[PDB]
Amino acid sequence: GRYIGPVCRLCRREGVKLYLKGERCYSPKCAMERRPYPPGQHGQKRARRPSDYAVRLREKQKLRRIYGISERQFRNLFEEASKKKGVTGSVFLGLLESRLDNVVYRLGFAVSRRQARQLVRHGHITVNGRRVDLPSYRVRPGDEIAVAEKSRNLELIRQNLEAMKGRKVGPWLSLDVEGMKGKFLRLPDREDLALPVNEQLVIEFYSR
Amino acid sequence: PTINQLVRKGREKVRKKSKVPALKGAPFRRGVCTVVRTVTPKKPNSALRKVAKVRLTSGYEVTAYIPGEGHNLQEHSVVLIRGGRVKDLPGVRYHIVRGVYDAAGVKDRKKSRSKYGTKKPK
Amino acid sequence: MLTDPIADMLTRIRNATRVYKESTDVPASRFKEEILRILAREGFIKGYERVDVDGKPYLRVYLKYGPRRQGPDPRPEQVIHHIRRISKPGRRVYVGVKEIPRVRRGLGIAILSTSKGVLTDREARKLGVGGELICEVW
Amino acid sequence: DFEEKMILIRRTARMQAGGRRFRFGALVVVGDRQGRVGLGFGKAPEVPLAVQKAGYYARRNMVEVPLQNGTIPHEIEVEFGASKIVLKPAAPGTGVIAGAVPRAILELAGVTDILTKELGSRNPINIAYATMEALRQLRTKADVERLRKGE
Amino acid sequence: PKKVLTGVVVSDKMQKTVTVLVERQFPHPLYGKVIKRSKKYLAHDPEEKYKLGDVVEIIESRPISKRKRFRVLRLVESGRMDLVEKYLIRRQNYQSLSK
RNA sequence: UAAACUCCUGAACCCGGGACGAAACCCCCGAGGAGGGGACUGACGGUACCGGGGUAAUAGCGCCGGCCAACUCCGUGCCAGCAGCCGCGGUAAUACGGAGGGCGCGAGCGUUACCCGGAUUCACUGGGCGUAAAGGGCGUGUAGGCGGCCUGGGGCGUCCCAUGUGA
RNA sequence: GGAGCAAACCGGAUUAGAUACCCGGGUAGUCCACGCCCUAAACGAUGCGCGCUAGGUCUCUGGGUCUCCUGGGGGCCGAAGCUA
Ligand SMILES: [Zn+2]
């Protein structure tokens, strides 16, 4: 399943702020903020010129952690992209961004993406009036993502939607906090994303 | 060669042969020992090894390296051949399988237990 | 006996270029014309003409080259980079229209032989007719 | 002021009664990542002082590359006598697939999508050089219809 | 339709039968070259009219015997001893092969 | 941030409801036809699903010298042993064995076996043969293979359209 | 058939040993006919035939009123190119 074990110890390994931490990573510590160096008994020690496989690998792992997803699933959603006509770089991320657990985070429903997952996998989250607790659901254009009636008044969501007030989020998503309803306008282009990742390395690393 | 030589004689095919007569191309073949004995290794190195000859199901008879620290294979003890060559020892292209049959696992080991039929402690 | 008249020409040409010769002859042929008539239509040469040598039909091929270069070895870039024969006399090669080759991504021509006549590549899918691939040129 | 990455720094050893003194091999690449690239190969008993020379020979030997929307202008094979190199154009989002060596060359060329392979020998030093004669022979359309014109 | 092949008689040494040999050039399924291959068929000649050297058109017919599944349709051109040799010349070669 | 600690969520389980798959044969009017009508039938199964209630609730495996990414301590001392290749072990081992930690991957992770790949190392695409493996000791010649310039008919090869097949 | 040379063979010396090097002698063989043998660093270690791609110089040979061209054959040097 998910990475369960410490997740703000990769925050370090990469050296790239991974806000898999809710309020934390923003605050004066994504851990990384306090310790900006690699984990372990070494880490803080003259770095070593990474190999091609490395840099590629590492740029490739950096991606998977952010979406907190199975490597089975990850790869198997990469192939899915390769096949379809279009640029594989962007398109790859598109599929990713059509994850029901992701659409949640990206819309703001849940504070982390680790929370955007459980909140779906607890039936808290519905689509088009019908419940869907499968974290993988591929969001199609137009689908109304939203919470159920059993959650309208739950501590957590009412402190996120409280913190979702108007503040723009996602150039491809309409969000109505008033009624707690969100919509997936369209598949996302590239410029709409800006993850600290090179989609032009990943494609490479997957040639071995 | 000219394409016309190819129409005629034609390109020749490789045909590879197995470095493991395990029969049935079987990933493992049961066998009982006949004699467990220590043998010194080859050119660049030296260390009295622990090996044994295993009479097979197929009426065969082969020598297979017993890896790991210490073993309890005597004479009439059955064992599972894993097939794999040890460069140190000339003419041994088979591995005894630990944690299987009369060949117990390894005593006290903790790292790589799967590669040695060793149960995880408590 | 001269095995393949057609590859000899492309070689006469090939060789004629490496030494940068203004002209080089090759025995006549109502077919060989159908080749040169193309290499000129596509600016690989200034053209040609049928000449008279000792009472024999020949074809002078006026060659073209780039400008003199700057620096080490003022060798001018070749106007005829490449001129290899694909369909050989020992190994004939015929292509259907639905598979005509593209020489060096569009910049190259694949002069071939078809029923409609002797044609280039784009001119072969223009009339949508395939044939025997004479040779590729760039 | 450009960009730098060395492919290897070998330890060549020579003979002389008593012992064996050594120099070094330093192959490097430089490229603004937008059409200008430079490979270099220097030598010096010092490992750093080597790549530092290679870097100067780099900025020296240059070559504009006819990048086509991030890729090659047309495929080419080029034999550098001992080693064979193959370059192909690729649609967007293909990536730099090549030996680690010619990769550096292209990734510094500004190349983003490419198909390549190394036939025959695979000596770094030579492959490099081939790849370099490769690019120094690429022909964009205009560069073509200009020659085949001569008006 | 009843398959038909053009060929050349190469034996009327049989009672009302003939040995028709037909070559069949065809592009090799790997090396392009157009390589000719040849087969022998036996045709039912009830009128004992078709002699040696004959070039004929034979038609896929209702079986006449063990290996007689073709009848000769019509002649093409008589005097053709030239081709017939080509076959009989290859015959004499087999001798100088064994040991 | 890992842990404890706080809060919330609530797999498991509990009760309640509970199928789709199943409309035809059958029957009346009509005529035993068309059509309209009326009636039975479910192994899976009291399962899926739905509603309510609801507890923080297994981690494992390979590796960490180079290829190949992840290093230190300790023991051992060409011993014990690792190994796919090059090789490591003879007091300082990131290669043997524990541990610390770390890289990969996760209900899998390794291993063996076999298949293609890499092997462009049988090469049509795509290799070669002066010394690296490789020109027949040298000729004549059979079958075969290959074949100059021109006009014409045929149109086998070849090319093309339609069409039948290509379940 | 057998003069000369000459494996083997004996002898002299050398050498620790010397079936070898060196020397004196020595038979098959080397030569002829007829037959068989069919091997090789049978080497240019480069199959053959044809067209193409600067020249310089030496030699062998054939033709042409010739300090020169024109064919053929044997060498060296080097345009381009080829090559690890
Ligand atoms: Zn963090």
CATH number of the domain that residue C86 is part of: 3.30.1490.10
Phi and psi angles of residue C109, each rounded to the nearest 5 degrees, phi first: -110, 145
Contact (CB, 8 A) for C47 and C59: no
Instruction: For residue A107, give Cα distances in angstroms to A64, A124, A135, A170.
Output: 20, 15, 15, 7
CA–C1' span, E75 to F144, in Å? 29
Name B95's bridge partners. Answer: B65
Whole-angstrom distance, CA of residue E72 vs CA of residue E56: 7
To one decimal, the resolution in angstroms is: 3.8
- Scan residues 64-93 of E and list those with Cβ closer than 8 Å to B: none
Whole-angstrom distance, CA of residue C116 vs CA of residue C126: 11
Angle at D23 between CA D22 and CA D27, to 5 degrees: 140
Which amino acid, one-letter code, is at C82?
A: H
Say whether A118 sits in a helix, a strand or coil: helix
Sort out which chain A residues have CB atoms less than 8 A from D103's CB and list them: 52
Do the chains contact at B6 and E31, CB–CB below 8 Å?
yes
Using a 10 angstrom Cβ sphere, with 0-12 exposed, 13-18 middle and 19 or more buried, the burial of residue D71 is buried
From which experimental method does this structure derive?
X-ray
Whole-angstrom distance, CA of residue E90 vs CA of residue A95: 69
Which segments of A are annotated as binding site? Answer: 8, 11, 25, 30
Contact (CB, 8 A) for D80 and D39: no
Name A127's bridge partners. Answer: A130, A145
Question: Hey, what are A35's tokens?
Answer: 């310790």
Residue range(s) defining the domain that contains residue C33: 3-80
Number of domains chain E is built from: 1
Name D80's bridge partners. Answer: D83
Residues C72, C126, single domain; the answer is no
Domain ranges of chain D: 3-63, 64-148
Which of E17, E36, E26, E14 has its CA nearest to residue E87? E36
One DSSP character per residue, C29-69 reads -TTHHHHHHHHHHTTSEEEEEEEESSS-EEEEEEE-B-PPP
Number of domains chain C is built from: 2
Whole-angstrom distance, CA of residue B2 vs CA of residue C38: 30
Say whether E55 sits in a helix, a strand or coil: strand
List the helix and strand counts (H, then E) for chain E.
Answer: 1, 7
Instruction: For residue B93, give Cα distances in angstroms to B19, C2, C104.
Output: 7, 60, 52
Where does chain D break, by residue before each gap (C–N > 2.5 Å)? none
Residues C108, C138, single domain; the answer is yes
Whole-angstrom distance, CA of residue D74 vs CA of residue D87: 8
Question: Hey, what are D18's tokens?
Answer: 């008593």
CA–C1' span, D116 to G84, in Å? 24
Look at the block and give the residue holding tokens 């002069």: C111
Which amino acid, one-letter code, is at C7?
A: A
Angle at A103 between CA A130 and CA A174, to 5 degrees: 85
**D3-63 CATH, one of 3.40.309.10, 3.30.160.20, 1.10.3720.10, 1.20.120.790:** 3.30.160.20
Phi and psi angles of residue A83, each rounded to the nearest 5 degrees, phi first: -60, -60
Residue range(s) defining the domain that contains residue E34: 1-99
Round the CA-based radius of gyration of chain B to a whole number and report it.
Answer: 20
Helix (H) or strand (E) holding A115: helix A115-121
Q: Who among D89, D148, D150 is closest to C105 (CB)?
A: D89
Whole-angstrom distance, CA of residue D13 vs CA of residue A84: 53
Look at the block and give the residue holding tokens 């649609």: D91
CATH of segment(s) D64-148? 3.30.230.10
Contact (CB, 8 A) for D119 and D86: yes
One DSSP character per residue, A46-90 reads ------HHHHHHHHHHHHHHHTT--HHHHHHHHHHHHHSSS-HHH
Phi and psi angles of residue A203, each rounded to the nearest 5 degrees, phi first: -50, -35
Please indicate whether chains B and E are in contact, defined as at least 3 beta carbon pairs under 8 Å.
Answer: yes
Name B91's bridge partners. Answer: none
One DSSP character per residue, chain D reads ----EEEEEE--B--BTTB--B--EEEEEEE-SSSEEEEEEE--SSSHHHHHHHHHHHHHS-EE---BTTB-SS-EEEEETTEEEEEEE--SS--EES-HHHHHHHHHHT--SEEEEEEEB--HHHHHHHHHHHHTT---HHHHHHHTT--
SS (H, E, C) A1-40: CCCCCCCCCHHHHHCCCCCCCCHHHHCCCCCCCCCCCCCC
Angle at D39 between CA D36 and CA D41, to 5 degrees: 160
Helix (H) or strand (E) holding E26: strand E26-27
Question: Hey, what are A123's tokens?
Answer: 């039936």
Phi and psi angles of residue A185, each rounded to the nearest 5 degrees, phi first: -50, -55
Whole-angstrom distance, CA of residue A125 vs CA of residue A100: 9
Report DSSP state, residue A123: T
Whole-angstrom distance, CA of residue E32 vs CA of residue D118: 28
Those residues whose beta carbons lie under 7 A from strand G are C 1-3, 8, 11-12, 15-16, 18-19, 21, 24; D 79, 81-82
**Chains linked to D by 3 or more Cβ pairs within 8 Å:** A, C
Report DSSP state, residue E45: -
Angle at A48 between CA A194 and CA D5, to 5 degrees: 70
Phi and psi angles of residue A147, each rounded to the nearest 5 degrees, phi first: -85, 170
Q: Which nucleotides of F are covered by protein (CB under 7 A)?
A: 1-2, 7-11, 50-52, 56, 59-64, 67-72, 78-90, 97-107, 109-115, 120-124, 127-129, 142-151, 156-161
Which among D96, D101, D106, D108 is the top mutation candidate for probing chain A, defined by the most A β-carbons within 10 Å of its own β-carbon?
Answer: D96
Whole-angstrom distance, CA of residue A195 vs CA of residue B87: 50
Chain E residues with at least one Cβ partner in C under 8 Å = 31-34
Instruction: For residue E55, give Cα distances in angstroms to A153, D103, E8, E36, E82.
Output: 98, 65, 4, 18, 11
Domains located in chain A, CATH noted? 1-96+194-208 (1.10.1050.10), 97-193 (3.10.290.10)
Report DSSP state, residue A163: G
Name A144's bridge partners. Answer: A183
Instruction: For residue B78, give Cα distances in angstroms to A92, B15, B20, B83, B117.
Output: 54, 34, 20, 16, 16
CA distance to partner chain C, nearest, from residue D95 (Å) = 19
Say whether C21 sits in a helix, a strand or coil: coil
Contact (CB, 8 A) for A94 and A187: yes
Residues C138, C96, single domain; the answer is yes
Helix (H) or strand (E) holding C126: helix C122-126
Contact (CB, 8 A) for D83 and D104: no
Residues with Cβ within 8 Å of E48's Cβ and at least 6 positions away in sequence, in order, are E12, E16
Neighbours of C46 (CB within 10 A): 13
Question: Hey, what are D44's tokens?
Answer: 């010096």
Neighbours of B79 (CB within 10 A): 25
Contact (CB, 8 A) for A115 and A122: no
Question: Hey, what are D22's tokens?
Answer: 């050594």
Within residues 39-68 of protein chain A, the ones with CB less than 7 A from nucleic strand F are 39-42, 45, 48, 50-54, 57-58, 61, 64
SS (H, E, C) A135-162: CCCECCCCCEEEECCCCCCCCCHHHHCH
Q: Is C66 on the interface with D (CB under 8 A)?
A: yes
> CA B30, B33, B34, B39 torsion: positive or negative?
positive
Phi and psi angles of residue A107, each rounded to the nearest 5 degrees, phi first: -85, -30
Look at the block and give the residue holding tokens 């293909």: D94
One DSSP character per residue, chain B reads --HHHHHHT-PPP-----S---STT-S-EEEEEEEEE-----SS------EEEEEETTS-EEEEE--SS-----SS-EEEE-----TTSTT---BEETTBTTB---SS--TTGGGGT-----
> CA A47, A51, A57, A62 torsion: positive or negative?
positive
Look at the block and give the residue holding tokens 């090659």: D72
Using a 10 angstrom Cβ sphere, with 0-12 exposed, 13-18 middle and 19 or more buried, the burial of residue E43 is buried
Contact (CB, 8 A) for E70 and E60: yes
Round the CA-based radius of gyration of chain A to a whole number and report it.
Answer: 18
Q: What angle do helix axes A88-97 and A100-107 make, rounded to 10 degrees?
A: 80
Report DSSP state, residue E57: E
How long, in residues, is chain E? 99
Residues C63, C75, single domain; the answer is yes
A177-198 CB burial, b ≥16 within 10 A, e <16: beebebbbeebbeeebbeeebb
Instruction: For residue C27, give Cα distances in angstroms to C7, C21, C124, C136, E71.
Output: 12, 17, 27, 21, 51
Alpha helices, H only, E1-99: 81-95
Question: Hey, what are A106's tokens?
Answer: 């990206």
Q: Who among A52, A89, A207 is closest to D93 (CB)?
A: A89
Percentages (nearest 5) of helix, strand, coil residues in chain C? 25, 30, 50
Look at the block and give the residue holding tokens 């192939």: A79
Residues C76, C116, single domain; the answer is no
Residues with Cβ within 8 Å of E11's Cβ and at least 6 positions away in sequence, in order, are E18, E19, E52
**Cα-to-centroid distance, A202 and ligand 1 (Å):** 23
Do the chains contact at C107 and D74, CB–CB below 8 Å?
yes
Do the chains contact at C77 and D147, CB–CB below 8 Å?
yes
Look at the block and give the residue holding tokens 């819309």: A107
Neighbours of D72 (CB within 10 A): 25
Question: Hey, what are E79's tokens?
Answer: 């005097």
Contact (CB, 8 A) for D29 and D58: yes
Whole-angstrom distance, CA of residue A81 vs CA of residue A95: 8
Contact (CB, 8 A) for E46 and E82: no
Say whether C94 sits in a helix, a strand or coil: strand
